Structures are given as structure tokens and as C-alpha cells.
Subunit: 46 residues, 4 copies
Amino acid sequence: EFSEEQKRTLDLLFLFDRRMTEERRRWLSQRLGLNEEQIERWFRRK
Amino acid sequence: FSEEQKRTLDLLFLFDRRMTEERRRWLSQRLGLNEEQIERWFRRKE
Amino acid sequence: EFSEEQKRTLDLLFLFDRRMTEERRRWLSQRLGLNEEQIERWFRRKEQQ
Amino acid sequence: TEFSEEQKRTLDLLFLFDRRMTEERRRWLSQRLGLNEEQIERWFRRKEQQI
Ligand SMILES: [K+]
Ligand SMILES: [K+]
Ligand SMILES: [K+]
Ligand SMILES: [K+]
């Protein structure tokens, strides 16, 4: 179903998306003055 | 938490949900698969 | 200076940052009620400042 | 003026967000392609003025 090059591209964007979501939590915590426990509890609710 | 923080949070939730949709289109165009076929892969990658 | 399985990775994210910047502009116009030509050059004219 | 305060308050936010994600993307690439943050940023500055 998925080629080796198509799965290679998806696996790159998945890891990249995972990293950006982590850093946003680090960035929002620093900026909004919150702990990473809360903001991730926020984004998981919605 | 502050009523100016749900601002920064509700925006980036709407911002990121819009980018996820558009990532799925761009991937459907660059790779050749449909969007369901892409959205299913990202989901099963958890 | 680079590689062939390192340039693709850089090429992919460049086309991806390219697409995400366009759509953001479209999404901001829809939301802030501005046009895409205002947005496009308010942004990255802030690297001017 | 041309831009609203309630609009500029969104535009400023996403500029800092994008600027921060661009930093971390470079690092994430500098720690995955073996190259460095002046190599990676050079490549992106090159393709930017068309390649
Ligand atoms: K839910
Ligand atoms: K396309
Ligand atoms: K399923
Ligand atoms: K890593």
C-alpha cells in the first residue's frame, strides 16, 4: 500500500511533527508561565 | 489560568489543526495517496 | 558539502515550510480579515526589524 | 493604522512561534544529518533565494 519512499517521507514528517509539538510545549511554558503538565493536558482534552 | 492564555492556546490549537489538514493534502499531492490513506497512517503511528 | 540522502531531507522540509507559510497566510486572511498581500509582507518585513 | 491591535497581537505571536520552530528545526536537523546549525541554516538561506 505504502511505498518505501512514501513511508520514508511520512516517517520524516511524523518525527518532525513530534519534535515541533514538544518544543511548542517548552515554548508555551516559558512564555505563558505554565508547567508542561498543564499545556499538554490542555491539548489532549481538545 | 489567565483569560489571555486561552487566547494563546485556542489560537495555536486552531492554527495547528489547520496545518495538519494542509499537511495531509500536500502529502496526498506529493506522494500520490489519498488523504484518508495518509490520515490513517499518521493515526496508527500514534 | 552535503550528501544525497541529506539534501532530499532538506529539500522536503523546504517545500513543506513553503506550503505551511502559504496556508498560514490564507488562514490569517480568513481570520484577521486582511488580504494575503498585506500579511505576506508584514511577515518577513519584521526581519527588517 | 492599517493593522489592528487585536490582529497584531496574533501576528506577533506567530512570528515568535515560527522563529522558535525554525531554530528547533535546525537543531533537530543538525542532530540528524550530522551537519551543523551554520551548515543547515546556510542551505536554507541558499534555497531561499531560489535554487
Ligand atoms: K478529544
Ligand atoms: K501539490
Ligand atoms: K484504525
Ligand atoms: K535526535
